[PDB]
Each structure stands twice: as structure tokens, then as C-alpha cells.
Amino acid sequence: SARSLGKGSAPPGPVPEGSIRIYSMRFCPFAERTRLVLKAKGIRHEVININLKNKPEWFFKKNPFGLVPVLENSQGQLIYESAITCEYLDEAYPGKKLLPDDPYEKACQKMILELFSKVPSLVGSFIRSKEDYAGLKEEFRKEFTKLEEVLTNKKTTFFGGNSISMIDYLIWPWFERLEAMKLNECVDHTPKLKLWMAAMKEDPTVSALLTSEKDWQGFLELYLQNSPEACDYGL
Amino acid sequence: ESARSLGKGSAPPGPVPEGSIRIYSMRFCPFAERTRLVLKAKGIRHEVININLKNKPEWFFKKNPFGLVPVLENSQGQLIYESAITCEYLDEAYPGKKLLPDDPYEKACQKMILELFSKVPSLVGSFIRKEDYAGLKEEFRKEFTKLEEVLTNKKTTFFGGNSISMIDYLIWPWFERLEAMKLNECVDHTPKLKLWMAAMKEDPTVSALLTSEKDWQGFLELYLQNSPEACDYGL
């Protein structure tokens, strides 16, 4: 049931009443954002994994950009872009809100997300390709000092207060891979950010969705080998 | 004159008065025009401080760590930057008619359409910055086709329905500069987008904030030569 769907696969059926579907990939950190929100809010859903190296022909009608995550509900409505999917889920579902309702506090979370914007591309660059490592670790350190400054100025344990909120879940997938990439020395000069990473791993939602560093390395070696079995590593 | 832009050696501004809000802007900046369209549409009491973008004051780098306009500042000293964030903050923080739909899926559609528009501001910048023209005009036609497909599927005059909403004000500044840049032919294959442009010019908020073709070309001639008088052209 978790095996990814690829080129030649049959278009999926309609999403059943009272449920939502996520088009995802088990090792995609952008989709992990949406799955953290789905788990934190206790939302009943179904997962369809997409083979990103051998995409189903029907997947391009779900998203014109051809990227995961994509949400699909029973009315056939489609929502793409990880940040948009997270905001939509917090708005359309009941229970405790992950986004603060104060307009300024909500704007701060979106400004912090923009301060984090260079981190996903650095992770991408690090994974790919070596003599480049030194320069890239320096780049990581500079970006992390910007997040250290936010926590210093806020005087809180998390990026949106003394308890976890949307902003923490949005940036967590990249800090999760940091240790798997053996780049933990990049937070050795950011003590508040380091304490934040330890607090995040103790969160029940974060903890339930962690990928083991061996499963991630299994995926990565298959991905770097350009294998169409990468998305399905560990079955 | 309160409108002349502030440069190096200017005194840092005083506190924002109670009941008001300040926008740090530049009269020919399309990103800050988004924010000004929202302040005008919602009838928000505010003050404008223009920044000399070719002679930036030192005190301004404390208002935004990116050093860009627009920036909002209130009486509590709160600072909000990134044009899309400033617009959403104003819609939530102030009374009157909401520019954003209340439905979570309709709100998500507005943010997805904004993403479909994302290449247009950088093509405008590349065009203003040959022979390059033919290629750049073809890129404009491809991007404008994407917007025409949205209007074709919605069967409405505007991007969020039968009435003007936030998404229209967010993309309008770049369509406003088409005639000025002599790029009207780039929409001659997009009839619905062409009717939308005419409908936008009829809107009282849009009409009140239009820049004359002469003031714009007058600004551009000075800005391209790094003139410190560029931002204050037309007085």
C-alpha cells in the first residue's frame, strides 16, 4: 500500500467522504511538512506515494508543477505548494490552531520562514556532488546564526513561542536530515538552535514521523545511483 | 515636502502616532504599490515615508534585515516586511471589506495563482535591464498564457471571482507597467487577460494609484544611471 505509483499506473479513484488524500514521497522533506500538520491536527487521511524519478502520466493533472505534496479532497479540490497545503489544513480542520490567530504573530512566522529560505537549496547542493564541503558548511553556519538571532530576540524555546507551532514544523525536515548528513558541527556555534533541535525530537508529532538515518542513507545512495527504486527503499 | 525620499544623513523618523500605521515605500516600486493598493482599498489611516533606494539611510537597515521596501511600522514599534506578508497583515488587522475570501480553499487558490505569476516580476526586471527583446517577449507570452488559462477555467472577470480581490491587487503593478514598457503586444493572444486589464483600470483604488507613462519613463532614465534624484522624479 505504501509502494510508490509510477509511469503506466492507473489514475486513482475519488477521495472518500470525511477523508483527505496526500500525494507524497516518504523521503521528501517538503511533503514531510504537510504530514507533520496532518499528524499534529489528528486529521483522517490517506497517503499515495509518487515515484518522482518515473512519474505517473495522470499526476500532472494533480499539479501543473509536477511536485509533491498535493492535497485532494472529496469535492476534487487540489492544493499544491507545501506552505499552502499546511495553511489550508490548519484553516479547514478543527482542534488547536498551529498558526497564531494574532495578525502580527502570524506575519512573524511567515517572515521567519523567509529567513530560512536559503537552507533547502544548501541541503540539495550538499547532497549532490569533494572540495565543496568547507564552503557549504560555512554557508550553513551563516544561515543558522540568523535563526539563532530570532530565538535570542524572542527569548523563547521555539520559533513561535514557548510551545511548538506551525513555523517549527515547516523548518524541522531540514534539521532532521542534518545529523543523517553528518553536518551536526554546523550548529556547534548556535546553542539556542541546538537546544531547539533536542526539544523538537521530544515532540510526539516530530518523533512519530522521524526517518532513521539508515533508511535515509539507503534512499540517498539509490537516489544518487539514479535508481527508480529509490522512493521505495525499505519497501 | 513629506513625499521627498529620505537618504544618507536624514534623521530617523519619530514614533508612529496612535491609530495610524507607517509604510516605508518608493513611489515607483511595484512591490510597495501592492501594499499601497491595500491601504487605499481598506481606507486605512497611514503615513508614507519614501526611501532613496540609490542612497539608503543607515537607520533604515534596522527596519528590515533584507533592506527592501515595503515595510510596515505601527505605534507599538512592530515591523512587517515582504510585500505579500504586509498585504495579508493589513487585511486581517484592519476593519471593513475583506480582500481575501473567508473560504480556506478559495484563499489557497489565490496563493496558488500568485505562484503561477512568480516569473513575471523577474522578466520585467530583465527587460528593463538587444535582440534579448524577442526572447523576453516570448517568455512574457508563455507566462501570460498561464494566467489566461486560470481566467478561462474560472469563467469570471477577476482572478478571485466576479469582484476585485487581493490576488488582483497583488499582480496588477506589473500589468500597469506594460504600456509604459511598450509590451502590450505580449497580451494580444490573451483576450480574457486583456479585458481584466481594462476592468482593473476602471477600479477606483487602482485608478487613484496609477503612475503616468511620463513620470515612469522619467524615473527609469534616472534610475538606470544610478541617479540619487531618480526616486524623487516628478516631485
Residue numbers in the entry:
A (entry chain B): 5 to 133, 136 to 241
B (entry chain A): 4 to 132, 136 to 241
Paper text:
Among them, the omega GSTs (GSTO) belong to an atypical cytosolic class. We determined the structures of GSTO1 bound to three inhibitors (C1-27, C1-31 and C4-10) by X-ray crystallography.
The GSTO1–C1-31 structure was determined to 1.94 Å resolution with two molecules in the asymmetric unit. In each case, difference electron density maps contoured at 3σ show each inhibitor covalently bound to the Sγ atom of C32 in GSTO1. C1-31 and C4-10 bind solely through hydrophobic interactions, whereas C1-27 binding incorporates both hydrophobic and hydrophilic interactions. The seven-membered ring is flanked on three sides by Y229, I131, L226 and F225. The only interaction with the sulfonamide group is V127.
